[PDB]
Enzyme design. Structure first.
Site, short mmCIF file in Angstrom:
data_model
loop_
_atom_site.label_atom_id
_atom_site.label_comp_id
_atom_site.label_asym_id
_atom_site.label_seq_id
_atom_site.Cartn_x
_atom_site.Cartn_y
_atom_site.Cartn_z
N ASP A 1 0.84 -1.15 0.00
CA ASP A 1 0.00 0.00 0.00
C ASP A 1 0.90 1.22 0.00
O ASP A 1 1.68 1.43 0.91
CB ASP A 1 -0.88 0.01 1.27
CG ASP A 1 -1.92 1.09 1.23
OD1 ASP A 1 -3.01 0.86 0.61
OD2 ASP A 1 -1.65 2.17 1.78
N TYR B 1 3.06 9.96 -0.20
CA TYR B 1 4.21 9.31 0.43
C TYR B 1 5.51 9.70 -0.26
O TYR B 1 6.51 9.99 0.40
CB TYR B 1 4.04 7.78 0.40
CG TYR B 1 2.97 7.27 1.34
CD1 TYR B 1 2.79 5.91 1.53
CD2 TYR B 1 2.15 8.14 2.03
CE1 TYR B 1 1.81 5.43 2.38
CE2 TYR B 1 1.17 7.68 2.89
CZ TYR B 1 1.01 6.32 3.06
OH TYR B 1 0.03 5.85 3.91
N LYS C 1 -3.10 6.14 -3.92
CA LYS C 1 -4.12 7.03 -3.48
C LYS C 1 -3.99 8.35 -4.20
O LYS C 1 -2.91 8.78 -4.58
CB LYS C 1 -4.08 7.21 -1.96
CG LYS C 1 -3.94 5.88 -1.18
CD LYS C 1 -4.46 5.99 0.27
CE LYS C 1 -3.89 4.90 1.14
NZ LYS C 1 -2.38 4.81 1.16
N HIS D 1 -7.91 9.32 -0.96
CA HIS D 1 -7.15 9.45 0.31
C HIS D 1 -7.97 9.97 1.50
O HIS D 1 -7.91 9.38 2.55
CB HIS D 1 -5.88 10.31 0.17
CG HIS D 1 -4.73 9.83 1.02
ND1 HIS D 1 -3.43 9.76 0.56
CD2 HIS D 1 -4.70 9.37 2.30
CE1 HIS D 1 -2.66 9.27 1.51
NE2 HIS D 1 -3.40 9.04 2.58
N1 LIG Z 1 -5.17 6.21 4.05
C1 LIG Z 1 -4.48 6.86 5.00
O1 LIG Z 1 -4.69 8.20 5.29
C2 LIG Z 1 -3.37 6.22 5.78
C3 LIG Z 1 -2.76 5.04 5.33
N2 LIG Z 1 -1.72 4.45 5.98
C4 LIG Z 1 -1.23 3.15 5.44
O2 LIG Z 1 -1.20 2.15 6.44
C5 LIG Z 1 0.13 1.75 6.69
C6 LIG Z 1 0.42 1.58 8.17
O3 LIG Z 1 1.58 2.34 8.51
P1 LIG Z 1 1.34 3.22 9.80
O4 LIG Z 1 -0.12 3.08 9.85
O5 LIG Z 1 1.88 4.59 9.61
O6 LIG Z 1 2.16 2.49 11.00
P2 LIG Z 1 1.76 1.19 11.88
O7 LIG Z 1 0.55 1.33 12.74
O8 LIG Z 1 1.70 0.06 10.91
O9 LIG Z 1 3.08 1.05 12.76
C7 LIG Z 1 4.28 1.65 12.33
C8 LIG Z 1 5.27 1.77 13.49
O10 LIG Z 1 5.41 0.56 14.19
C9 LIG Z 1 6.80 0.34 14.31
N3 LIG Z 1 7.16 -0.94 15.02
C10 LIG Z 1 7.79 -0.86 16.28
N4 LIG Z 1 7.96 -2.11 16.76
C11 LIG Z 1 7.45 -2.98 15.85
C12 LIG Z 1 7.40 -4.35 15.93
N5 LIG Z 1 7.75 -4.87 17.11
N6 LIG Z 1 6.83 -5.08 14.88
C13 LIG Z 1 6.33 -4.36 13.79
N7 LIG Z 1 6.38 -2.96 13.72
C14 LIG Z 1 6.93 -2.27 14.75
C15 LIG Z 1 7.43 0.80 13.01
O11 LIG Z 1 8.82 1.00 13.15
P3 LIG Z 1 9.90 0.51 12.03
O12 LIG Z 1 9.28 0.79 10.65
O13 LIG Z 1 11.17 1.37 12.20
O14 LIG Z 1 10.25 -0.97 12.18
C16 LIG Z 1 6.64 2.10 12.93
O15 LIG Z 1 7.13 3.13 13.75
C17 LIG Z 1 0.95 2.91 6.18
O16 LIG Z 1 2.32 2.58 6.08
C18 LIG Z 1 0.19 3.32 4.95
O17 LIG Z 1 0.33 2.35 3.96
C19 LIG Z 1 -1.23 4.99 7.13
C20 LIG Z 1 -1.78 6.12 7.66
C21 LIG Z 1 -2.89 6.88 7.02
#
Ligand SMILES: NC(=O)C1=CN([C@@H]2O[C@H](COP(=O)(O)OP(=O)(O)OC[C@H]3O[C@@H](n4cnc5c(N)ncnc54)[C@H](OP(=O)(O)O)[C@@H]3O)[C@@H](O)[C@H]2O)C=CC1
Ligand SMILES: NC(=O)C1=CN([C@@H]2O[C@H](COP(=O)(O)OP(=O)(O)OC[C@H]3O[C@@H](n4cnc5c(N)ncnc54)[C@H](OP(=O)(O)O)[C@@H]3O)[C@@H](O)[C@H]2O)C=CC1
Lengths: 275, 275
Positions: B48, B53, B78, B111
């Site tokens: 995704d 981004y 998006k 989005h």
């Molecule tokens: N439509 C919309 O407006 C939105 C869409 N999204 C989508 O959803 C996706 C979800 O990402 P987002 O929602 O931002 O983040 P998440 O809720 O998926 O979590 C991200 C965080 O968790 C961390 N992390 C820490 N420990 C762990 C672990 N033990 N195992 C796995 N992860 C860990 C990552 O660090 P690290 O990467 O350094 O490992 C990062 O800081 C996005 O990337 C995007 O694709 C997100 C937000 C809004």
């Protein structure tokens, strides 16, 4: 202002050029790189970008491939809404430097007020300022309210407030507040994203002067003492747009343009954009 | 689902993997490229990204560098807020294709709804859908009313609604409505951007199961029948995150987690972000 090099002094004595190039909706790499180059080569000394424009890299490459010493240049960018907060702004700032290939920025703005996080984001700017990473610090899309609230706790008063400004939205209230506070107004979408260039009141005034509607508006900015940053991706419009130091608008013209106001926005209301 | 390959059928019969790589706040080129192909190397078949981004080029690169057949992968992107409007959405979509190096998207989303421009942003999605350049069209951060509203004039109903979803924010109502409408919920920020990984209640449940909180949360998304797309820039987190297919949460567990709910967001509210 009598030329492109012309400057407004910010409350900290930083001379910000009165005229600039905005690069919103301009595409990363070559478009942005070429626009930046074409403007600088034709005398622009001020570029306005944002983290969210996606084009810091092409802007940073324009600057370099431009041929003008870095210090004769005034480069602006903004922290995006998503990176608000003390630590995430610090980090957001460094990513901007790195994409820009700069060691310092001339201006760094909070992009939008929002709800909750802008005071801490300000604290982050202030610290970067003190660390000597930013020459001037300021704000974007702030209402008189946000400013009042900011000032409760500020160590440094914002130097610039970059808001949407044009004949259709003339910002009377915010202009008076800002000049009374030594906060300099800067116009975004100064051309109303092109939506005014058929306006019949403006075209009659352009006619008289032998100028384009875009020039008239742009001169209107200057005579009101609002920094301006029109955008174009076409080199002849970038030149057309700076070619405004060889005529003046009369009080008569100025008021006519002012009589265009509908208090009317083509971009977000900062009071409605809440994150 | 029983493996990473597993899918849900959208209302047009398209099959979307239950599990994906989210790529928000991951850096263009090497970081993106590497994240993607580490995921694909371990069975992920859904990624995704979004236009805003600005790693869409590193994603596309990692897609090709992974070696897996286009047709076995599910790519979502998006249309950003700044580019809503019928004509600008078509254009903004061609930009995503170009830098992704794709001929079609599997899923394209609005989005955010915002205030004004979504209904004909949708008309643009629909058109592209009929030109056969997008296999599925849907929406993100829509509320029940945005959806009611969309449906008053849509030719095609959203197939996916991607919204923020996690124990702090369990989207009870919205889930009933989408379920009934044949609209597939998908969780963004599933791990609450790391905020809950330390939650007490999720911890005892992780411990019991010999898993991490992140896995517990992830298994909880699936047992609720929500598509999920955790983000990590670390290949070991990516692998960990998908290792959720060999255990299961009971009814007690599920209800315990659920009881966390505080209607609490780490991202904007769709009803407040008014562009
Ligand atoms: N439509 C919309 O407006 C939105 C869409 N999204 C989508 O959803 C996706 C979800 O990402 P987002 O929602 O931002 O983040 P998440 O809720 O998926 O979590 C991200 C965080 O968790 C961390 N992390 C820490 N420990 C762990 C672990 N033990 N195992 C796995 N992860 C860990 C990552 O660090 P690290 O990467 O350094 O490992 C990062 O800081 C996005 O990337 C995007 O694709 C997100 C937000 C809004
Ligand atoms: N702080 C903030 O939140 C915001 C800041 N901004 C800033 O303001 C800057 C300028 O505002 P912007 O929104 O770009 O729009 P402008 O009002 O400056 O207008 C640009 C549009 O008008 C056209 N145009 C420019 N010059 C001419 C000309 N002389 N004759 C005919 N048409 C012309 C351009 O077309 P073309 O490119 O083809 O020449 C473009 O499509 C931005 O680049 C950005 O830096 C903008 C929005 C929000």
């Amino acid at each position: 202002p009598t030329s492109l090099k012309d400057t407004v002094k910010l409350h900290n004595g930083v001379e910000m050029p009165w005229f600039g190039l905005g690069v919103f909706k301009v595409e990363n790499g070559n478009e942005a790189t070429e626009s930046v180059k074409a403007a600088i080569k034709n005398g622009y000394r001020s570029i306005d970008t944002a983290a969210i424009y996606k084009n810091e890299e092409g802007v940073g490459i324009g600057i370099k491939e431009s041929g003008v010493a870095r210090e004769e240049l005034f480069i602006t960018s903004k922290v995006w809404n998503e990176d608000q907060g003390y630590e995430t702004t610090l980090a957001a700032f460094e990513k901007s430097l790195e994409r820009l290939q700069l060691d310092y920025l001339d201006l760094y703005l909070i992009h939008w007020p929002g709800k909750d996080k802008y005071k801490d984001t300000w604290r982050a700017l202030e610290k970067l300022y003190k660390d000597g990473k930013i020459r001037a610090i300021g704000v974007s899309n702030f209402q008189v309210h946000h400013l009042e609230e900011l000032l409760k706790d500020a160590e440094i008063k914002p130097m610039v407030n970059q808001v949407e400004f044009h004949p259709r939205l003339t910002q009377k209230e915010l202009r008076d507040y800002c000049k009374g506070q030594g906060i300099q107004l800067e116009a975004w979408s100064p051309l109303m994203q092109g939506q005014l260039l058929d306006n019949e009141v403006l075209t009659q005034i352009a006619e008289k002067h032998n100028k384009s509607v875009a020039q008239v508006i742009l001169r209107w900015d200057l005579q009101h003492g609002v920094v301006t940053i029109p955008k174009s991706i076409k080199e002849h419009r970038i030149i057309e747009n700076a070619d405004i130091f060889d005529f003046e608008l009369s009080q008569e013209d100025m008021d006519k343009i002012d009589a265009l106001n509908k208090d009317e926005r083509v971009g977000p209301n900062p009071d409605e954009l809440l994150f």
